[PDB]
CSV table of C-alpha atoms (C1' of nucleotides) in Angstrom, one decimal:
chain,number,residue,atom,x,y,z
A,1,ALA,CA,-14.7,-34.7,14.9
A,2,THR,CA,-17.4,-32.3,16.1
A,3,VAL,CA,-17.6,-29.5,19.5
A,4,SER,CA,-19.8,-30.9,22.5
A,5,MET,CA,-22.6,-28.8,24.2
A,6,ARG,CA,-21.4,-27.6,27.5
A,7,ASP,CA,-17.6,-27.8,26.7
A,8,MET,CA,-18.4,-24.4,24.5
A,9,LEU,CA,-20.7,-23.2,27.4
A,10,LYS,CA,-18.0,-23.3,29.7
A,11,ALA,CA,-16.5,-20.2,27.1
A,12,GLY,CA,-19.2,-18.6,26.8
A,13,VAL,CA,-20.6,-18.8,23.7
A,14,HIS,CA,-24.2,-17.9,24.6
A,15,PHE,CA,-23.1,-14.7,25.5
A,16,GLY,CA,-24.1,-11.9,23.3
A,17,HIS,CA,-24.1,-8.2,23.0
A,18,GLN,CA,-26.4,-5.8,24.6
A,19,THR,CA,-30.0,-5.5,23.0
A,20,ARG,CA,-28.9,-2.2,22.0
A,21,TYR,CA,-27.1,-3.7,19.0
A,22,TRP,CA,-28.8,-7.0,18.2
A,23,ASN,CA,-30.1,-7.4,14.5
A,24,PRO,CA,-33.8,-8.6,14.5
A,25,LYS,CA,-32.9,-11.1,11.5
A,26,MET,CA,-31.7,-13.8,14.1
A,27,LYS,CA,-35.0,-14.0,16.2
A,28,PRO,CA,-34.6,-17.7,15.4
A,29,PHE,CA,-31.4,-17.4,17.1
A,30,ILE,CA,-32.2,-15.8,20.4
A,31,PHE,CA,-33.2,-17.7,23.8
A,32,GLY,CA,-33.7,-14.9,26.3
A,33,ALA,CA,-32.1,-12.1,27.9
A,34,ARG,CA,-30.1,-12.0,31.2
A,35,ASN,CA,-28.9,-8.5,32.3
A,36,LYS,CA,-29.8,-6.3,29.5
A,37,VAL,CA,-27.8,-8.8,27.4
A,38,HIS,CA,-28.6,-11.2,24.8
A,39,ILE,CA,-28.7,-14.9,25.3
A,40,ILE,CA,-27.7,-17.4,22.1
A,41,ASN,CA,-29.7,-20.5,21.9
A,42,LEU,CA,-27.2,-23.1,21.2
A,43,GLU,CA,-29.5,-25.9,21.1
A,44,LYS,CA,-30.2,-24.1,17.7
A,45,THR,CA,-26.3,-23.9,17.3
A,46,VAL,CA,-24.9,-27.6,17.8
A,47,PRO,CA,-26.7,-29.0,14.4
A,48,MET,CA,-26.2,-25.8,12.5
A,49,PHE,CA,-22.6,-25.9,13.7
A,50,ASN,CA,-22.4,-29.6,12.2
A,51,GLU,CA,-24.5,-29.3,8.4
A,52,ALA,CA,-21.7,-26.6,7.9
A,53,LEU,CA,-18.9,-28.8,9.6
A,54,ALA,CA,-20.1,-32.0,7.4
A,55,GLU,CA,-20.2,-29.6,4.4
A,56,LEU,CA,-16.6,-28.5,4.9
A,57,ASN,CA,-15.2,-31.9,5.4
A,58,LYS,CA,-16.5,-32.7,1.8
A,59,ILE,CA,-14.5,-30.0,0.1
A,60,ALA,CA,-11.7,-30.8,2.5
A,61,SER,CA,-11.2,-34.2,0.6
A,62,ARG,CA,-11.4,-32.8,-2.8
A,63,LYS,CA,-8.8,-30.7,-1.7
A,64,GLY,CA,-10.3,-27.6,-2.3
A,65,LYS,CA,-9.2,-24.2,-0.8
A,66,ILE,CA,-10.7,-22.1,2.2
A,67,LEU,CA,-9.8,-19.1,3.8
A,68,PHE,CA,-10.3,-17.9,7.5
A,69,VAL,CA,-10.7,-14.0,8.1
A,70,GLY,CA,-10.2,-12.1,11.2
A,71,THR,CA,-9.4,-8.7,11.4
A,72,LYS,CA,-9.7,-7.9,15.5
A,73,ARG,CA,-6.6,-8.1,17.5
A,74,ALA,CA,-9.0,-10.1,20.2
A,75,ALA,CA,-8.5,-13.1,18.1
A,76,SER,CA,-6.2,-12.2,15.3
A,77,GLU,CA,-3.3,-14.5,16.2
A,78,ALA,CA,-5.6,-17.4,17.2
A,79,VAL,CA,-6.5,-17.6,13.4
A,80,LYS,CA,-2.9,-17.6,12.6
A,81,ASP,CA,-1.9,-20.8,14.4
A,82,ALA,CA,-5.3,-22.4,13.3
A,83,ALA,CA,-3.9,-21.9,9.8
A,84,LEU,CA,-0.6,-23.4,10.6
A,85,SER,CA,-2.1,-27.0,11.8
A,86,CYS,CA,-4.2,-27.3,8.7
A,87,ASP,CA,-1.8,-25.2,6.5
A,88,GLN,CA,-4.5,-23.5,4.6
A,89,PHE,CA,-4.8,-20.2,3.6
A,90,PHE,CA,-5.8,-17.0,6.0
A,91,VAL,CA,-5.7,-13.5,6.5
A,92,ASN,CA,-5.5,-12.0,10.0
A,93,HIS,CA,-4.6,-8.6,9.7
A,94,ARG,CA,-6.4,-6.5,7.4
A,95,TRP,CA,-9.0,-7.3,4.4
A,96,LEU,CA,-8.2,-5.7,1.4
A,97,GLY,CA,-11.2,-4.7,-0.8
A,98,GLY,CA,-10.3,-7.3,-3.6
A,99,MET,CA,-8.9,-10.1,-2.3
A,100,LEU,CA,-11.4,-12.3,-4.6
A,101,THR,CA,-13.0,-9.8,-7.0
A,102,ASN,CA,-10.0,-8.2,-7.9
A,103,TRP,CA,-7.6,-11.2,-8.0
A,104,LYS,CA,-6.3,-10.1,-11.0
A,105,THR,CA,-4.6,-7.0,-9.4
A,106,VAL,CA,-3.6,-9.1,-6.3
A,107,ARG,CA,-2.1,-11.6,-8.4
A,108,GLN,CA,0.8,-9.2,-9.7
A,109,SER,CA,0.9,-7.7,-5.7
A,110,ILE,CA,2.0,-11.5,-5.0
A,111,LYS,CA,5.0,-11.3,-7.4
A,112,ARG,CA,6.4,-7.9,-5.7
A,113,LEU,CA,6.8,-10.0,-2.6
A,114,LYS,CA,8.0,-13.1,-3.7
A,115,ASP,CA,11.0,-11.7,-5.7
A,116,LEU,CA,11.6,-9.1,-2.9
A,117,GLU,CA,11.6,-12.4,-0.4
A,118,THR,CA,14.2,-14.3,-2.0
A,119,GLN,CA,16.5,-11.3,-2.9
A,120,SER,CA,16.5,-11.1,1.2
A,121,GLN,CA,18.0,-14.3,1.0
A,122,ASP,CA,20.8,-14.1,-1.8
A,123,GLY,CA,22.4,-10.6,-0.1
A,124,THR,CA,20.9,-8.2,-2.1
A,125,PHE,CA,20.6,-5.5,0.3
A,126,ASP,CA,24.1,-5.7,1.3
A,127,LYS,CA,24.6,-4.5,-2.7
A,128,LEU,CA,22.4,-1.6,-2.6
A,129,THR,CA,22.2,1.6,-0.8
A,130,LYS,CA,21.4,2.0,3.1
A,131,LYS,CA,18.2,4.0,1.6
A,132,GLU,CA,16.7,1.7,-0.7
A,133,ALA,CA,17.5,-0.9,1.6
A,134,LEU,CA,15.4,0.5,4.1
A,135,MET,CA,12.8,1.0,1.5
A,136,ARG,CA,12.9,-2.9,0.1
A,137,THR,CA,12.7,-3.8,3.8
A,138,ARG,CA,10.1,-1.6,5.1
A,139,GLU,CA,7.6,-2.7,2.2
A,140,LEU,CA,8.6,-5.9,3.4
A,141,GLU,CA,6.9,-6.1,6.8
A,142,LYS,CA,3.9,-4.7,5.4
A,143,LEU,CA,3.2,-6.6,2.4
A,144,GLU,CA,3.9,-10.1,4.6
A,145,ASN,CA,1.6,-9.1,7.2
A,146,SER,CA,-1.6,-7.9,4.9
A,147,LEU,CA,-1.1,-10.5,2.3
A,148,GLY,CA,1.4,-12.9,3.9
A,149,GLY,CA,-1.0,-15.7,4.8
A,150,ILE,CA,-2.5,-15.9,1.1
A,151,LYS,CA,0.9,-15.8,-0.7
A,152,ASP,CA,0.8,-19.6,-1.5
A,153,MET,CA,-3.2,-19.5,-2.9
A,154,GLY,CA,-2.9,-20.3,-6.3
A,155,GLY,CA,-6.1,-18.6,-7.4
A,156,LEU,CA,-9.3,-18.6,-5.9
A,157,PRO,CA,-10.4,-20.8,-2.7
A,158,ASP,CA,-13.3,-22.5,-2.9
A,159,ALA,CA,-14.2,-21.8,0.4
A,160,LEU,CA,-14.4,-18.9,3.0
A,161,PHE,CA,-14.7,-18.9,6.9
A,162,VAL,CA,-15.5,-15.7,8.3
A,163,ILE,CA,-15.9,-14.5,12.2
A,164,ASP,CA,-18.6,-11.5,13.0
A,165,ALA,CA,-19.9,-10.4,9.3
A,166,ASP,CA,-21.0,-7.3,10.9
A,167,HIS,CA,-17.5,-6.1,11.2
A,168,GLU,CA,-16.4,-8.1,8.1
A,169,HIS,CA,-19.0,-7.6,5.8
A,170,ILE,CA,-16.9,-6.6,3.1
A,171,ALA,CA,-15.5,-9.7,2.6
A,172,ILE,CA,-19.0,-11.7,2.5
A,173,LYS,CA,-20.3,-9.3,-0.4
A,174,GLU,CA,-17.1,-9.9,-2.0
A,175,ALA,CA,-17.4,-13.8,-1.6
A,176,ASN,CA,-21.1,-13.8,-2.8
A,177,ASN,CA,-20.0,-12.3,-6.0
A,178,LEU,CA,-17.9,-15.1,-7.3
A,179,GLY,CA,-19.9,-18.3,-6.1
A,180,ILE,CA,-18.0,-19.1,-3.3
A,181,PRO,CA,-19.8,-20.9,0.1
A,182,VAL,CA,-19.1,-18.9,3.0
A,183,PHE,CA,-19.1,-20.1,6.7
A,184,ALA,CA,-19.4,-17.4,9.1
A,185,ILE,CA,-19.8,-17.3,12.7
A,186,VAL,CA,-22.1,-14.7,12.7
A,187,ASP,CA,-22.7,-12.8,16.3
A,188,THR,CA,-25.9,-11.5,17.6
A,189,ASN,CA,-25.6,-7.7,16.1
A,190,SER,CA,-25.0,-8.9,12.6
A,191,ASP,CA,-27.4,-9.9,9.7
A,192,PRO,CA,-26.6,-13.1,8.8
A,193,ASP,CA,-28.7,-13.2,5.4
A,194,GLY,CA,-25.3,-13.5,3.3
A,195,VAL,CA,-23.7,-16.1,4.9
A,196,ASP,CA,-25.0,-19.7,3.3
A,197,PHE,CA,-24.2,-21.9,6.5
A,198,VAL,CA,-25.0,-19.5,9.2
A,199,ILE,CA,-23.5,-20.1,12.9
A,200,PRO,CA,-24.9,-18.2,16.1
A,201,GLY,CA,-22.3,-17.4,18.9
A,202,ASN,CA,-19.9,-15.3,20.2
A,203,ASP,CA,-16.4,-14.5,19.5
A,204,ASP,CA,-15.3,-11.8,21.7
A,205,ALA,CA,-13.7,-14.1,23.8
A,206,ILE,CA,-10.3,-15.7,23.0
A,207,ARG,CA,-11.0,-19.0,24.5
A,208,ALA,CA,-14.7,-19.3,22.3
A,209,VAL,CA,-12.7,-19.0,18.9
A,210,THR,CA,-10.2,-21.6,19.9
A,211,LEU,CA,-13.4,-24.2,19.7
A,212,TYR,CA,-14.4,-23.1,16.3
A,213,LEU,CA,-11.1,-23.0,14.2
A,214,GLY,CA,-9.4,-25.9,16.2
A,215,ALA,CA,-12.3,-28.0,15.1
A,216,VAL,CA,-12.1,-26.4,11.6
A,217,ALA,CA,-8.3,-27.4,11.5
A,218,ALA,CA,-9.6,-31.0,12.6
A,219,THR,CA,-11.8,-31.5,9.8
A,220,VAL,CA,-9.6,-30.0,7.3
A,221,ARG,CA,-6.8,-32.8,8.5
A,222,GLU,CA,-9.7,-35.3,8.0
A,223,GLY,CA,-10.0,-34.1,4.3
A,224,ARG,CA,-6.8,-33.9,3.1
A,225,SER,CA,-6.0,-37.4,4.5
B,1,A,C1',-8.2,25.9,-41.5
B,2,U,C1',-3.0,24.0,-39.5
B,3,G,C1',2.3,22.0,-38.4
B,4,G,C1',6.8,23.5,-36.1
B,5,C,C1',8.1,26.8,-31.7
B,6,U,C1',6.8,30.7,-27.8
B,7,G,C1',4.3,33.2,-23.5
B,8,U,C1',0.9,32.0,-20.1
B,9,C,C1',-1.8,30.2,-15.2
B,10,G,C1',3.0,27.9,-13.1
B,11,U,C1',8.2,25.9,-11.2
B,12,C,C1',1.8,26.4,-8.6
B,13,A,C1',1.4,21.1,-6.9
B,14,G,C1',-1.2,19.1,-8.8
B,15,C,C1',-3.4,15.7,-13.3
B,16,U,C1',-5.1,10.9,-14.8
B,17,C,C1',-5.6,5.3,-16.1
B,18,G,C1',-6.4,-0.3,-15.6
B,19,U,C1',-9.0,-3.5,-12.3
B,20,G,C1',-12.6,-3.7,-8.4
B,21,U,C1',-16.3,-1.6,-5.9
B,22,U,C1',-20.9,2.0,-4.9
B,23,G,C1',-25.0,4.7,-7.9
B,24,U,C1',-30.9,3.9,-12.8
B,25,G,C1',-27.0,7.4,-14.1
B,26,A,C1',-24.5,11.8,-14.7
B,27,A,C1',-20.5,10.2,-11.7
B,28,A,C1',-17.9,8.6,-7.1
B,29,U,C1',-14.2,5.5,-4.6
B,30,G,C1',-8.5,5.4,-4.8
B,31,U,C1',-6.9,11.4,-4.8
B,32,U,C1',-10.9,11.7,1.8
B,33,G,C1',-9.4,11.4,7.1
B,34,G,C1',-4.8,12.0,11.6
B,35,G,C1',0.0,14.2,11.4
B,36,U,C1',3.9,15.9,8.5
B,37,U,C1',6.5,18.2,4.3
B,38,A,C1',9.2,22.8,0.0
B,39,A,C1',5.5,18.6,-2.6
B,40,G,C1',-1.2,13.7,-3.2
B,41,U,C1',6.4,13.9,0.4
B,42,C,C1',6.0,10.0,3.6
B,43,C,C1',4.0,6.6,7.9
B,44,C,C1',-0.8,4.7,9.4
B,45,G,C1',-5.7,4.3,9.1
B,46,C,C1',-9.3,3.4,5.3
B,47,A,C1',-13.4,-0.8,-0.4
B,48,A,C1',-9.9,0.2,-2.3
B,49,C,C1',-5.5,-2.5,-4.9
B,50,G,C1',-1.8,-1.0,-8.1
B,51,A,C1',0.0,1.9,-12.0
B,52,G,C1',1.7,6.5,-15.0
B,53,C,C1',2.5,11.9,-16.2
B,54,G,C1',4.5,15.4,-12.5
B,55,C,C1',7.6,15.8,-7.2
B,56,A,C1',12.4,14.4,-5.5
B,57,A,C1',16.6,12.0,-7.8
B,58,C,C1',20.3,11.6,-11.5
B,59,C,C1',22.8,16.7,-14.9
B,60,C,C1',26.0,21.5,-14.9
B,61,U,C1',28.2,25.3,-11.8
B,62,U,C1',29.9,26.7,-7.0
B,63,A,C1',32.0,26.0,-1.5
B,64,U,C1',36.4,21.2,0.9
B,65,C,C1',40.4,17.4,0.2
B,66,C,C1',42.9,13.2,-2.3
B,67,U,C1',45.5,11.2,-6.6
B,68,U,C1',47.2,12.4,-11.7
B,69,U,C1',50.1,15.8,-15.1
B,70,G,C1',53.5,21.1,-15.1
B,71,U,C1',53.4,24.1,-20.8
B,72,U,C1',53.1,29.8,-22.5
B,73,G,C1',51.0,28.0,-15.7
B,74,C,C1',53.0,28.9,-10.6
B,75,C,C1',57.6,30.6,-6.8
B,76,A,C1',58.1,27.8,-1.0
B,77,G,C1',63.3,25.3,0.0
B,78,C,C1',68.8,26.7,-2.8
B,79,G,C1',72.2,30.5,-6.3
B,80,G,C1',73.1,34.8,-10.2
B,81,U,C1',70.4,39.8,-10.4
RNA sequence: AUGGCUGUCGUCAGCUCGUGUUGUGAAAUGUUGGGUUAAGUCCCGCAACGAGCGCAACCCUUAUCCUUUGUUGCCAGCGGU
């Protein structure tokens, strides 16, 4: 399973940001400029998207763990259902500095969630004071919407998928410290030197990111099968 | 030379740690920021994530009612003074 050339063109994958934000480390990923904004050379993209997709299908068959990362509301929910298809792990709201490097801390932050999840089922809040019931409930929405998508990780992922290494450069700096391959969809204004398998393109369009993770959800099903 | 015990800034609201992270390093980060509160009190944000001593609470007393008991306490409903 792979993506075609013109199907991504209808989504606007070539459309980048203004030339007032571009990063000079991507000159080999630039086609030209139209209306003072950059245009991404997609003929370079498709092959560079497939050497990554061929590598991603390798670790999916070995039953490794991947991680989708997206912290922008214009794509924050498309990454959720994408992770629901290939039942892998994801973080769609806020990347806490320490999901990988400080995993020894967030692991006990996990047990804070589980017992609170199960006692929210046996009827413990009908036994508690309404103020403590207000306390244990308000924190439940905060934790489930922060690390709820990585609640069944069981350790460290064998891979990690990123969206825009410019806004999420906190994640790419951590992933390199543990020795984990990084697959990012670096926009034209980001520095892709911290990514192993770089993929030029746009993401500020909801229809654009649906092409990506959907295809990533496909390759994982090829692997787990 | 000390222990134990006390005053004191101050009943002011602060003081630190583990891990991660930034810096050659002293250290920084968290503990800053937007509001708010008696209060690093609480929420959101955030390379920080949690934790501890404190803060508050749990304690005593006082302000209201109910239940239980009625002496040497007390005096309404009834008699003798």
